[PDB]
A paper describes a structure:
Methylation of cytosine 32 in the anticodon loop of tRNAs to 3-methylcytosine (m3C) is crucial for cellular translation fidelity. Here, we report the cryo-electron microscopy structure of the human m3C [name] methyltransferase [name] in complex with seryl-[name] synthetase ([name]) and their common substrate tRNASer. We show that [name] acts as the tRNASer substrate selection factor for [name]. We demonstrate that [name] augments the methylation activity of [name] and that direct contacts between [name] and [name] are necessary for efficient tRNASer methylation.
Despite attempts to crystallize the complex, we could only achieve two crystal forms of [name] bound to SAH and the complex disintegrated during cryo-EM grid preparation. To determine whether [name] binding to [name] induces conformational changes in the enzyme, we compared our structural model to the crystal structures of [name] bound to either SAM or SAH, but without an RNA ligand. The methyltransferase core of all models aligns well. Deviations occur exclusively in the m3C-RBD, in particular in the divergent N-terminal region, the substrate-binding loop and the β-extension. All RNA-free structures display disordered substrate-binding loops, which seem to adopt their shape only in contact with the [name], and a conserved helix following the substrate-binding loop is rearranged on interaction with the ligand. Our data suggest some degree of flexibility in the region of the β-extension hairpin, a region that is completely unresolved in the crystal structures, suggesting its plasticity for tRNASer accommodation. Thus, while the core of [name] is rigid, parts of the m3C-RBD seem to be more ductile, to accommodate the [name].
Author numbering: 29 to 55, 61 to 249, 255 to 271
The structure:
Amino acid sequence: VSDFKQQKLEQEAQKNWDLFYKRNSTNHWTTREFEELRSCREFEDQKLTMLEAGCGVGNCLFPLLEEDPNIFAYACDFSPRAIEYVKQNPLYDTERCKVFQCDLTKDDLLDHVPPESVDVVMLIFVLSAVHPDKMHLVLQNIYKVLKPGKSVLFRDYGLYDHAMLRFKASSKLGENFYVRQDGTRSYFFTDDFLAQLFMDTGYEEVVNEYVFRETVLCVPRVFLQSKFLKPPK
Ligand SMILES: Nc1ncnc2c1ncn2[C@@H]1O[C@H](CSCC[C@H](N)C(=O)O)[C@@H](O)[C@H]1O
């Protein structure tokens, strides 16, 4: 295990993510995200407001803004370089999306998104970054913004995913919890763990299924793919 370095890696979780956005090129969302995105819409062109948590460069989101022109995207990420990288992109349309630095385990989302304002939150490959101790914090932060009948679309690394089977016991922070070389972490989800996180934080399970996919020598990538709902009043 990494012992004290863990507290160091946690303390620097933003920085390594910020550094990751430094060195790397801008450079994944399945159709399920896009297809389920529209299923949250009752009127055929109902205007939907979506929070894409952990936006990164929003490489996946920005086409979705073009593909569907009648949705608003509150996008946040705690990497400042990440945000500017989306700020710099020409596709950025201040009308389409409000992007803002937020560490979801620290910053109340009501600073930028009105409470119960968003139709759908996308937790795509983000919860694996945050420390498992603090994950429910991300879920509490996003409950505040979810309309009381709306849902969270979650895709993330799942148990026994390729990356989990590639890591040496030296990258292992703990059970199903690993640090990538650049110091960003990957937690490899199990259906039960995510379910409890969502149950504890007040959501209701719609879909919680492992999804197996072919990496682009291939061992399947295992992604835990799920939909959770804010219970209605
Ligand atoms: N506590 C936190 N608050 C905000 N963003 C976080 C975070 N922990 C991790 N992240 C973000 O998690 C992301 C993992 S990759 C995100 C991009 C992905 N294509 C997507 O659609 O979500 C990084 O952009 C990182 O900055």
